[PDB]
């Protein structure tokens, strides 16, 4: 709701088109929105995500044109895309590492948010919509990985549909329905194909609303101070038009990212993946080294920290008359690790937006960051000591941070002096 200037038909083609359908008008107001003059490199992840969503979708349609979703041809079909299809070998790898870049981006994007209070009002809707997008991304990323029909594909398909078996009561039903049968088989692979295709368009739709939401709220800056909304004059003091000032900055950043991304796809396309998925799916053997996709590791760590013999698991199992046992607890612990993050707008009680001015917060935040990296690292080790412990403390600190620490800092912590205007911070 910032003060700028609106569309002015120039040519004839523009006056003609405008009195009928103002597509040009709206696209203008969108590309000219005034945004804070100060915005560090941490604001480029929104674009890298957009590009990824587009990259994934086109390379996807293309790959769907050669892939066959059927247990007997599925794996073969992808090896064909690799050896025969013109440039398939490079399109396949782009789609695969595209998922990886997609997540590295969404995490960097997310943490950027946790730190600058981008989830704090009025941006509470941007956050929830973004949170839905995140959920969809994983659901998608999962089904995709099932398609090649390799060892990881098959068992991850077995384990992830298993999480719904954990739900008390209905659980066995929800699972049989997802599988279309008594086990992960063709019926599953086939429906997963149809959904892997469909979900990205749903994400795209949300990204529209995600954008719409932060566009009708104005962007946030590293200051937490909003843009002065009282005059086109002082508003222009705090801002700069999105185009071309930030599109060039963003596109420029997007080029450096892609530079590295292609370096990976060209030289080490198989670094970020699991060698066991080049082994055809085997329903009678589970690879000894089965490990999730790196972008799933942290939530995987959290799920297997909670075993039968964890004190708190034990208590819950007790007071739940058995219903909440170890299995279902890890399921709830994992999904909860995400649900807890979706509620940050209502747990962080400090009224100071940017955490650049919250000296106490800064510390628990970087611990959270280190925790996520540690959590990820642990998901890849065995369940033996001391990993079982490390995993436990880590999971612990996660909920600690959202459920206890943030609510408390809100009342304790003595905030620092935030610039009175974006203007005064930029000039600095």
């Amino acid at each position: 709701g910032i003060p700028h200037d609106h569309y002015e038909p120039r040519t004839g083609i523009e006056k003609w088109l405008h009195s009928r359908l103002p597509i040009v008008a709206l696209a203008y107001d969108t590309i000219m929105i005034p945004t804070p003059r100060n915005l560090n490199w941490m604001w480029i992840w929104g674009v890298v995500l957009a590009f990824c969503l587009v990259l994934q979708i086109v390379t996807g349609i293309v790959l769907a044109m050669h892939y066959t979703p059927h247990v007997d041809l599925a794996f073969a079909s992808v090896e064909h895309i690799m050896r025969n299809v013109n440039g398939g070998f490079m399109l396949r790898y782009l789609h695969a590492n595209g998922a990886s870049l997609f997540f590295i981006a969404v995490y960097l994007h997310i943490f950027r948010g946790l730190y600058y209070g981008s989830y704090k009002a009025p941006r509470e809707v941007t956050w929830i919509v973004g949170m839905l997008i995140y959920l969809a991304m994983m659901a998608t990323a999962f089904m995709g990985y099932v398609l090649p029909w390799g060892q990881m594909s098959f068992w991850g398909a077995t384990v992830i549909t298993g999480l719904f078996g954990a739900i008390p009561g209905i659980g066995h039903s929800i699972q049989t329905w997802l599988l279309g049968g008594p086990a992960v088989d063709n019926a599953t692979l086939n429906r997963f194909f149809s959904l892997h295709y469909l979900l990205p368009f749903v994400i795209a739709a949300l990204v529209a609303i995600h954008i719409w939401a932060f566009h009708s709220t104005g962007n946030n800056n590293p200051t937490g101070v909003e843009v002065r909304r009282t005059s086109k004059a002082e508003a222009q003091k705090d801002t700069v038009p999105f185009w071309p000032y930030f599109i060039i900055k963003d596109v420029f950043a997007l080029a450096v990212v892609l530079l590295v991304f292609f370096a990976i796809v060209g030289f080490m396309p198989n670094y970020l993946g699991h060698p066991d998925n080049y082994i055809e799916a085997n329903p009678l053997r589970t690879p000894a080294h089965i490990v999730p996709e790196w972008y799933f590791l942290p939530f995987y760590a959290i799920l297997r920290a909670f075993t039968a013999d964890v004190w708190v698991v034990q208590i819950a199992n007790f007071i739940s008359f058995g219903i909440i046992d170890a299995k279902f607890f890890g399921v709830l612990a994992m999904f909860g690790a995400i649900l807890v993050m979706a509620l940050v707008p209502w747990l962080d009680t400090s009224p100071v937006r940017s955490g650049r001015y919250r000296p106490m917060f800064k510390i628990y935040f970087w611990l959270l960051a280190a925790d996520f990296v540690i959590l990820t690292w642990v998901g890849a080790q065995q369940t033996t000591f001391p990993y079982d412990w490390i995993s436990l403390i880590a999971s612990a600190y996660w909920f600690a941070y959202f459920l206890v620490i943030l609510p408390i800092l809100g009342a304790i912590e003595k905030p620092v002096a935030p610039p009175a205007t974006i203007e005064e911070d930029f000039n600095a």
Binding site: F252, G266, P275
Partner: protein, 256 residues
């Protein structure tokens, strides 16, 4: 578990400017045909790729000839016949012998240090290197531990990790004490089991190093194509970046 030792071999193709050695592949193809092929298939590798550039690159007439040595079953007729080069190498002959098509990619030889995958980032997955070791890994004598307690039918291997180990070689907790374990694959090579046309040595060291470069290519045929693609993308973007940079710098210049 399964995180053991693998011999770092300096392959011609490891490297961003790496490239297959047209002759290695050729030799390798001979080893695979005269030794490995006996038990292992390559079901995802179309024989005609032997002709395709960036690989062994044999002329069609040979490739057509080669493919003759297989007894394929024609899909339309159902009856057997000569092998056309439009046919895929057959399945593994020996039912428990894994397919070697993707084998150079379905194994890691370099497992990160602290489990941080930093060893793999600098040495590659090491799939060929691992296959190399598994071949040059059959020692003449079992580890003193296994003396007499050797499973009959399996053979000790200094690099193989997912095999069974005699009770007598596990320590206090179950962990195995031997560097390797027991495979069901009787050591394949033995000096000069294959005689390369040009006389190039057939030491089990060389042969194994060659079938590897071949098996690497069997799995990654578009390796060179991919790398050339790599370069190009990097130049396009190193330039586009530098330019996009200046355009940026020389634009905000009119503000800050």
């Amino acid at each position: 578990a399964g995180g053991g030792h693998v011999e770092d071999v300096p392959f011609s193709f490891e490297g961003p400017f790496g490239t297959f050695d047209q002759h290695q592949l050729q030799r390798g193809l001979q080893v695979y045909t005269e030794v490995c092929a006996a038990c292992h298939g390559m079901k995802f590798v179309p024989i005609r790729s032997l002709s395709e550039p960036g690989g062994p690159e044999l002329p069609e007439d040979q490739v057509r000839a080669y493919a003759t040595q297989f007894t394929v079953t024609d899909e339309e007729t159902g009856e057997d016949r000569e092998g056309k080069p439009t046919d895929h190498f057959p399945h593994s002959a020996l039912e428990n012998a894994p397919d070697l098509s993707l084998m150079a990619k379905a194994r890691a030889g370099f497992h990160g240090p602290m489990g941080t995958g930093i060893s793999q980032l600098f040495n590659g997955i090491g799939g060929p290197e691992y296959i190399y070791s598994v071949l040059t890994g059959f020692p003449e004598e079992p580890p003193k531990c296994a003396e007499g307690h050797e499973p009959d039918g399996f053979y000790y291997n200094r690099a193989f990790q997912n095999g069974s180990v005699p009770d007598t070689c596990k320590d206090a907790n179950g962990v195995k004490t031997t560097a390797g374990s027991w495979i069901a694959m009787p050591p394949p090579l033995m000096d000069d089991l294959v005689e390369y046309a040009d006389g190039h040595d057939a030491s089990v060291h060389a042969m194994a190093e060659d079938v590897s470069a071949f098996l690497m290519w069997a799995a990654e045929p578009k390796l060179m194509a991919r790398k050339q693609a790599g370069f190009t993308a990097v130049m396009f973007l190193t330039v586009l970046s530098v330019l996009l940079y200046l355009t940026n710098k020389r634009l905000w210049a009119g503000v800050k």
